[PDB]
Every structure is written in structure tokens, then in C-alpha cells.
Symmetry: C3
Subunit: 223 residues, 3 copies
């Protein structure tokens, strides 16, 4: 009886703490900057246009088209690198092309069967599949949905789902919102599971390089 | 030679610390309360009786029967909610019906293929399959076992295994023992992997509501 | 505008911390002790010779041959135990036969489909398959390779990959280098995911027993 009351009080404390955390995340999402360089429809159309070719040729053509359409906002060939991404129980790899305080663009995918938590979104993400399959299991439902090359899954602000990718699944991902808040999730398993400090090095390095490119382009466009 | 001695001393320290942790868990489990509302055979039979229907109809009928035989011990329809559960490398979802200091009842399952650590049990758990398959790989053996709808897997007090569930696997779970000790494992991956603070919110909220229902029924009785 | 600079500075802090960690791991791995009892080719051939039999008979014969060719360096039958191993998102089981400050030998495998991060290697590992399949996805590439019984996968000093094992995959693993540096990765999921303190107990116990056996053999060979 007394232990039950103590447990209920502790659970209520954890409840209000977690609620405060979620509210602070929502506040940082709301009060974030809304200066956007790209649009989700643009990236979706550009990725869907090349979804029928081989995924490597699609990567190359999409990178060339992005550098053509937005000069100074895409990393150079010397800065492109495949970096592992372990998060929410799943493992894939990314190649970052653009990343700012409010937007990011990358090529994400896995060559093996994987799956796990989508990650509690607090920014808007869009994934247009180039190859493979994407099984999404939304919250509150007991059934999943499959998406194929050409489809574009939009992960909204409040959504959390179960993601699963078959072997050889590759897609182009564009994220809009409070981008730094995603880093934590993208590195969670890197910190407490894989102990891969060199992957963390590569991730923070490519993010810092993208931020430096954005600042340099800003200065060159106001200079 | 010296680094070997330092490593051995560190290993012995970790050994005694882990042993003390296990001893504290065992002591809190044994000297825990044993006031039981349900029995594992009751829940097992109730789930096996409706395992042949569709799993949603089975959920509905099992909830109705539980409210009929135990009215003040099952959450209301307004309090039922599917909450994600990330633990031991696997991901599923639960709907809690009953939960006290010594017992809990829920509907657990996944719509995708998943698997991982069963979690070092320090309470007794029972899962009666309604749909899908349950692959259990016990500790110390090199072979696994498959379980189908109608079967009931009993996770004993000391057992730790490797669990795996195929897509669309749904079952009814009843646990008796030191329930708070399970929260740690049930929230480990929620804390250090998914960063899903809202799922933690939902979990602690439904547990607090179940405890409140139990306390209200106790006070009214 | 200012937040971009602040975020870049924070990323530089994380960058230099991770770089120091990687450099310290490389330096502590280098200039390390070089007292080696086994060689990867010996273990590879011993396992490949018995890869055609049942994996349990193969385990037994390999243990007998290891005790025959290297007496006093393999644990006794009373000290052999199957211990779960949760790491990098995957889960298997091990039976440790030899383990020192510079080398370790064990029988590793899983009875279920599993996979995840290989673990950022800072020691040289070799896995010779007795049964099942081993899918390895090296870093920087978008395609994986499958290995079958008889094959030997060599995880080099700097490599990090994605490992995947099908149900019933069993192999003999020999690791050479700075063995303690692997311990962290071997226990990460045990600490922050499974909460399995008894598996941690078993792991540290068998490692201490292997170290004690090695020290006893050293003393008996100089005594």
C-alpha cells in the first residue's frame, strides 16, 4: 500500500518530466527559423525523375542537378563521403550533400535488411525511394504499409513509426525544421551501442563542413 | 604483466558490482508482495480460447471477458492506447489493461519482423500467442524453438533468452512479481536508443492510471 | 546567423574530443605488447577442416585440437559456458576458450537471424565459419558480400562494417591486438539495452578465469 503510493508518485514525477521535455522540443520546433532554400516538392520530383535508373547513376545525376540548380549550397566531390548511421536499432549509411541550421539533404540507405524506430520526429522529413522497399508501421495502428521506388514518404512533425528497409534500399532524404535536434537521435546508437567514435567524428565533420559552406555562400552572396 | 593485473582487478570489481546488483534484484523480487488478483492459467486459457478468431476480435472479446470477470481491475476504453515498446533491441507495441505493484496484464505484439533480448527476467511472465510466431532461444543452448497461436510461453524467474517475433504477431501477456523492476528494461532502449520522450510519457501515464484504478478499486472495496 | 557559428563551434568541440579518442585508441593499440600464442591461419585451417561436420562435433574437435597443440592456454571443461553477447544491435552467444591481454579465442554464433554494427575494430579479428552465412557490408561501399562455411572473414585494424548472421550461424573467432579495447563494445548493449547484469557477470567471470589461466601457465613455465 505504501510502496504503491511511492511508485505512483515516482511515476507522476517521471510523467511531468517527460511532458516538460516534449513541450520544450515542441517549443524549439515552433520557434525555429523558417528561411528555406529548398522545397520538399522539388527534392521529391528530382528524386522520382531518376528512380528508374540504377541507384548509383541516379545518385550521380541528382548530385549534378542539385549543384547545377543551387550553386554554392552542395558540397564538393572532395567532401562527399559514405558515413554509417546507427540509430533506433537500425543501421544504414548516409552521404550528406547540403545541411544548414534549418535544412539538410542527403542520400540515405542500407545494403542489408534492417529496421527499428523511425525516431520521434520534431522536424519535417521527406524520403523519396530510389531502390528497395520501405515498410512503415504508424503509431496506434496494427498494420504496416509498403512503399516502392518512386513513392515519397513524408514524416510529419508529430509522427513516430516503425521503419524497415530491405537489402539494397536507397533513397534521397530532405529534412526541414530544427536540424540540430535530429543529431542526437542520429548518434544515439553511436554513443551507447556501437562505440564507433570515428563515425561520430565523420558525422560532426561533414555537418561542420556543410555549415561552413553555407556561411561562406552567405558571405559571398552579401559580399 | 602489470596491465594484466590491472585488467584482472577491474574485471573482479565489475564482477562483484554485477553480483551485488543481481543480489539486490533477487532480494527485492522475493521479499515482494504476493497479493495476486489473476492467475497465469486464467489469462492463458482466456487467450487460447479466442486465438482462432481475428486478432482484433480476439482483443475485443478478451477485454470484454476480463471486464466481466474482473470489473474494477481493467482500464476503461478511454484509457486504452497502443504504446510503442523498444527494449533489448526489439520494437513492438502494448495495450495495458491491468497493472499493479505485483501484477500486470497487457496485449503485446508487432506488425513487423523484430527480435532481440528477452530481458533478464526477475518476474514471471506468460505469453499466449493469438497470431504470428514466437521464436525463443534459451540461454546455454545452441538451438531455438518455435511457438504458434494457442501455445503459451512461460518466462520463468531466472530465465534470459533471445526472443523473435514475425510480422503480425500478437499475444496476451500476464506478468506477476516485482513489476517496477521490469520498467528499467522496458525503457532502456527508449532512453538510450530511440530518444522517444513521448513514448516514455505514454508508458508512465498508462502505468500511473492503472495503479490509480487499482487503488480506487481497493479503496472502494 | 549567430546560431550557425555557435553550432559550428560545438561541432568542433565534439570533433576534437572524438579525434582524441580515436588517436588514443590507435596509439594504445600500437606500441602494445606483441606476445602472441596463436595465429589466425592456424585457427582458420583448424576450423575449415571441421566445417563439414555438425557444428557441435566441430566445436568439440576444435577444442580438443587447441588443447593438444597449445596446452595450458585453453580453459577446462568446468570453465566452458555459453554466454549471451549483445553488441552493436546484434545478439549472439560465445564460449571463450582462450583470452589474454593480446589475444582471445572463442566459439561464436547465433541460433536466430541477427545483425548490426561490427564494432569499430581496434584489434585484428578473424572469423572462420563452421555453419550458416555471414553477410559483411564494408564501410564506404553500397554492396555487401556473403561468406559460407569454410570462408574466413578478416576484420582488419581500422575496419568498421555491418555484420549479419542468419539463423544457425556458428564460427570460431580469434582476435589479436589490444583485447581490452574491444570489451567496451562487447558490453555496451549489455549496459544500455538489455540490463542483463548476470550476462555481464558471466562475461567478466570467464575473462578473469582466462586471464588467471594465462598467468598460471606463465608462472608454471618460469617456475
Amino acid at each position: 500500500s505504501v510502496d504503491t503510493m511511492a511508485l505512483w508518485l515516482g511515476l507522476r514525477a517521471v510523467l511531468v518530466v517527460a511532458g516538460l521535455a516534449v513541450l520544450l522540443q515542441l517549443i524549439r520546433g515552433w520557434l525555429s527559423s523558417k528561411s528555406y532554400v529548398f522545397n520538399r516538392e522539388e527534392i521529391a520530383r528530382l528524386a522520382k525523375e531518376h528512380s528508374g535508373l540504377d541507384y548509383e547513376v541516379a545518385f550521380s545525376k541528382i548530385i549534378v542537378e542539385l549543384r547545377k540548380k543551387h550553386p554554392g549550397h552542395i558540397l564538393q566531390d572532395e567532401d562527399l563521403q559514405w558515413v554509417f548511421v546507427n540509430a533506433g536499432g537500425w543501421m544504414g549509411s548516409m552521404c550528406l550533400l547540403h545541411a544548414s541550421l534549418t535544412e539538410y539533404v542527403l542520400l540515405f540507405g542500407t545494403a542489408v535488411d534492417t529496421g527499428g524506430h523511425s525516431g520521434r520526429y520534431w522536424a519535417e522529413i521527406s524520403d523519396t525511394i530510389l531502390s528497395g522497399t520501405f515498410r512503415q508501421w504508424k503509431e496506434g495502428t496494427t498494420k504496416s504499409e509498403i512503399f516502392y521506388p518512386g513513392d515519397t514518404i513524408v514524416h510529419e512533425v508529430g509522427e513516430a513509426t516503425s521503419v524497415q528497409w530491405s537489402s539494397g534500399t536507397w533513397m534521397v532524404e530532405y529534412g526541414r525544421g530544427f536540424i540540430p535536434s535530429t543529431l542526437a537521435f542520429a548518434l544515439a546508437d553511436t554513443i551507447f551501442s556501437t562505440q564507433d567514435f570515428l563515425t561520430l567524428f565523420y558525422t560532426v565533420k561533414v555537418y561542420s563542413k556543410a555549415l561552413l559552406l553555407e556561411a561562406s555562400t552567405h558571405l559571398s552572396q552579401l559580399g
